[PDB]
Design a protein around this ligand. Structure first.
Ligand SMILES: CCCCCCCCCCCCCCCCCC(=O)OC[C@H](COP(=O)([O-])OCC(O)COP(=O)([O-])OC[C@@H](COC(=O)CCCCCCCCCCCCCCCCC)OC(=O)CCCCCCCCCCCCCCCCC)OC(=O)CCCCCCCCCCCCCCCCC
Ligand SMILES: CCCCCCCCCCCCCC(=O)SCCNC(=O)CCNC(=O)[C@@H](O)C(C)(C)COP(=O)(O)O
Ligand code: SF4
Ligand code: SF4
Lengths: 96, 208, 82, 113, 114, 176
């Protein structure tokens, strides 16, 4: 940031870019190293009523795997999912 | 059960169940079990004589097209007489799906190599040789891949200790790195952590 | 290789170079396992020394049967003319 | 319209995709006639191959054929037809419509132990 | 008791494979002594090969000796193709390891191991 | 939702062909690369003057370990062994007994700093803020066993760095 405008002009000419608008060295635009103290929020289970753990127990809703076939007519041939939709070319910048 | 519980995907569960029935009835010669997990992952548990015919099916069939071998895995489970559980994770890019193909072997029965189906397996089952001692028949260049060159023992077997049986040091008498029996200056401290209370009643096994 | 006697003397020379065989009890019809008192790997390295001397390769199906120096000189005779 | 590239490296553009797909589908059905009738591979593969062959015979366009076969480019549809043909030729030799060759041990797929 | 074989249908094919592996190691020992520029003799290296073969000489299972021949072929390929260094060859000669007490009385003197 | 990198057909009119030939014969992109290297030549470098200038750290930084005290001199560690239970590398070795006033205190608090992975699971497992991982990162030794800290060394690191450790905890305890 302390470069003279002659060196700054030579530098912007050699790079071809306005380098002072986007400097890679950091200055007073960055955050303070001392911040105010946060007040972090609580989640949805911080409630005093209607908050039984059995109604939100994720680990105890996991089941053993359903055995579809075990060795102890004109039905449709299936796939593991529908076929994948063809991706669309970018409207942003397709390079086309 | 909205915020903290994982949302269940019923559509994928029904579709993978239908495709598991599909594979179980196209290939009843080798398919032993078919299961779908609660988080919607299909497992085809097969006989080890059908490693090539099942994997060639899923790779080449027009309703499967599992063209990618994501991962090939063994698991040592010493309580089974076929202690090694060979796991083939497969990816169909056409149907955007994943399947798991599982089989078994013990220490002495060879599994047929799947390099003719997926070339990706060339190192993976090679690693299953190095880490578990599962021999793979008709592998092109089957040898060790991760251990040291004079390494005795298959380390990811669960009877193999955490520190090994040997440790290296440089010895200035012989001017050479040497191998000696392992002595730890501090033993690894085994922690018995398991609670004496049942955690998941849905997984309760029937008693004797 | 020209005559059987030179092959026999050379077989016995290779056998007496082999240090585990006692050169007194070394004869033409002595057995390796029960007379000379040898391991099987001893017989295998004897056959490899015969390949070192005689300049040809002996396969496995016809080296398991070579249990005496007479069988060795007969096998070297049969893979040549004499 | 003669598509310039398929976009996939090493997958060459097919000049006549319709005739190649008709040849490959009838060849799959001819190989597939040598499988027993009750085998599920035969019933399912005849079903999907007749569906794809009727879609090919119903559409003269190449682009619309790609968008209703729904298997990507037409050349990888040809590649999948070749893969299904090779598969069915192997399924004749393997005979996987047979019963199960061996039951597993009693606690082979029991998890946890 | 009907098991799938690895290479050998019986023990005689297995002994054939053991024998060919021993022939290949026996031929390899002088080249191994030379190019790894070892401090042992060719006779001492062949003694170590014979010791390692006799170590497994009690096995009666064809599949176990098939895996032993497979692992010996792997060690041989690691020796011929120079993938081992000198240290991996010399690990068969436990030289820096002090000799363990063998009888009862010296094991009593040194500690608690039976 | 996808784009094609490198699927451009170059124009074949005489203008563009002569542009590409002036590029080939007159090295125009090579002068462009020399220009960008010359452009960094006249920039101020990013080089700080270590050891007089220091890299910027945050108050969360996980450096050297320290056993802390209360504002009475009593050590915070009440020997609960949670830090060595959670310790992913098993670097913490703890032995305890009741001392002369009956208090639950350690007789051994070792941290092998060459097993330690510096992940700070000990300072978040600690219920009384006894073990922390302080702000010192410049503690390289000349000997391996100088990095095998016992309870005396860790309490001395606490007494050494406490004026800084307390302020870092004061900055970050409302995120914990
Ligand atoms: C070309 C030949 C060199 C001419 C001097 C020169 O270009 O100075 C850089 C000077 C400043 O360039 P800058 O990179 O923008 O400097 C920004 C700094 O923040 C501005 O500099 P600063 O803020 O860091 O100021 C302090 C600096 C001040 O810098 C100087 O005094 C520059 C060096 C003068 C010699 O002094 C020092 O750091 C002491 C350095 C002492 C040794 C300098 C080298 C001596 C070489 C011969 C022996 O360049 C110009 O003013 C433009 C070019 C002038 C060329 C004149 C025609 C020839
Ligand atoms: C320089 C250092 C290099 C060291 C070389 C290490 C080579 C390690 C390869 C190990 C391969 C084996 O040991 S497999 C041998 C196991 N064989 C058996 O259990 C079958 C029994 N085999 C035998 O008794 C063998 O002596 C014979 C020669 C096949 C038959 O002899 P018997 O008759 O009397
Ligand atoms: S920072 Fe991590 S590895 Fe280090 S002592 Fe603490 S818990 Fe153990
Ligand atoms: S440092 Fe903390 S976690 Fe570790 S034993 Fe002491 S009080 Fe417990």
């Amino acid at each position: 940031a302390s470069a003279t405008r002659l060196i700054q002009g030579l530098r912007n000419w050699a790079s071809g870019r306005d380098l002072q608008a986007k400097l890679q060295l950091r200055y007073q635009e960055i955050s303070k190293r001392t911040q105010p103290p946060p007040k972090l929020p609580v989640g949805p289970s911080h409630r005093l009523s209607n908050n039984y753990y059995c109604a939100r127990d994720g680990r105890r809703e996991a089941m053993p795997p359903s055995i579809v076939m075990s060795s102890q007519s004109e039905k449709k041939a299936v796939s593991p999912a529908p076929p994948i939709k063809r991706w669309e070319l970018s409207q942003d910048e397709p390079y086309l | 059960t909205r915020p903290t519980v994982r949302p269940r995907n019923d559509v994928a569960h029904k579709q993978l169940s239908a495709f598991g029935e599909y594979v179980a009835e196209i290939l009843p010669k080798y398919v032993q079990q078919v299961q779908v997990s609660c988080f919607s992952e299909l497992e085809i548990c097969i006989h080890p004589d059908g490693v090539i015919p099942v994997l060639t099916f899923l790779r080449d069939h027009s309703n499967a097209q599992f063209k990618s071998l994501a991962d090939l895995t063994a698991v040592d489970i010493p309580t089974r007489q076929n202690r090694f559980e060979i796991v083939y994770n497969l990816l169909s890019l056409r149907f955007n799906s994943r399947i798991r193909v599982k089989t078994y072997t013990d220490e002495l029965t060879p599994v047929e190599s799947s390099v003719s189906v997926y070339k990706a397996a060339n190192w993976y089952e090679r690693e299953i040789w190095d880490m578990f001692g599962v021999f793979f028949a008709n592998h092109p260049d089957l040898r060790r891949i991760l251990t040291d060159y004079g390494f005795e023992g298959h380390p990811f077997r669960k009877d193999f200790p955490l520190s090994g049986y040997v440790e290296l040091r440089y010895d200035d008498e012989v001017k050479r790195v040497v191998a000696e029996p392992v002595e730890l200056a501090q033993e690894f401290r085994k922690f018995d952590l398991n609670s004496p209370w049942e955690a998941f009643p849905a997984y309760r096994q029937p008693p004797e | 290789p020209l005559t059987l006697e030179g092959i026999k003397d050379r077989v016995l020379y290779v056998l007496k170079l082999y240090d585990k065989i006692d050169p007194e009890k070394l004869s033409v019809n002595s057995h390796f396992m029960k007379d000379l008192g040898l391991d099987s790997l001893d017989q295998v390295e004897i056959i490899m020394a015969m390949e070192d001397e005689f300049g040809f390769e002996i396969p496995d199906i016809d080296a398991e049967k070579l249990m005496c120096p007479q069988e060795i000189v007969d096998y070297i005779a049969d893979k040549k003319d004499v | 319209l003669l598509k310039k590239t398929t976009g996939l490296v090493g997958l060459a553009v097919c000049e006549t995709p319709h005739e190649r797909l008709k040849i490959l589908y009838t060849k799959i059905l001819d190989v597939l006639g040598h499988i027993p009738k009750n085998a599920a591979y035969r019933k399912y593969t005849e079903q999907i191959t007749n569906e794809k062959l009727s879609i090919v015979k119903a559409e003269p366009d190449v682009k619309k054929l790609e968008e209703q076969l729904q298997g990507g480019q037409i050349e990888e549809v040809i590649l999948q037809a070749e893969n299904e043909l090779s598969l069915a030729r192997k399924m004749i030799q393997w005979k996987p419509w047979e019963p199960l060759v061996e039951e597993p041990p009693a606690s082979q797929w029991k998890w946890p132990i | 008791t009907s098991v799938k074989p690895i290479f050998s249908r019986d023990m005689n094919e297995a002994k054939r494979r053991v024998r060919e592996l021993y022939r290949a190691w026996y031929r390899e020992v002088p080249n191994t002594v030379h190019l790894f520029q070892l401090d042992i003799s060719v006779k001492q290296g062949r003694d170590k090969v014979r010791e390692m073969f006799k170590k497994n000489a009690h096995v009666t299972d064809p599949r176990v000796v098939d895996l032993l021949v497979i692992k010996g072929k792997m060690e041989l390929e690691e020796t011929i193709n120079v993938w081992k260094q000198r240290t991996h060859v010399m690990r068969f000669f436990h030289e820096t390891e002090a000799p363990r007490p063998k009888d009862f009385l010296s094991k009593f003197y040194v500690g608690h191991d039976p | 939702t996808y784009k094609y990198v490198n699927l451009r057909e170059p124009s074949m009119d005489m203008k563009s062909v002569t542009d590409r030939a002036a590029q080939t014969l007159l090295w125009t992109e090579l002068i462009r690369g020399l220009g960008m290297t010359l452009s960094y030549l006249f920039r101020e470098p990013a080089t700080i003057n270590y050891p007089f200038e220091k890299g910027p750290l945050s108050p969360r930084f996980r450096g050297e370990h320290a056993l802390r005290r209360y504002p009475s001199g009593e050590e915070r560690c009440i020997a609960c062994k949670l830090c060595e239970a959670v310790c992913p590398a098993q670097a913490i070795t703890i032995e305890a007994e009741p001392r002369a006033d009956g208090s639950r205190r350690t007789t051994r608090y070792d941290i092998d700093m060459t097993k330690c992975i510096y992940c700070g699971f000990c300072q978040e497992a600690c219920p009384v803020d006894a073990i922390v991982e302080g702000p010192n990162f410049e503690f390289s030794t000349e000997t391996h066993e100088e990095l095998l800290y016992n309870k005396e060394k860790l309490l001395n690191n606490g007494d050494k760095w406490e004026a800084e450790i307390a302020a870092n905890i004061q900055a970050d305890y409302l995120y914990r």
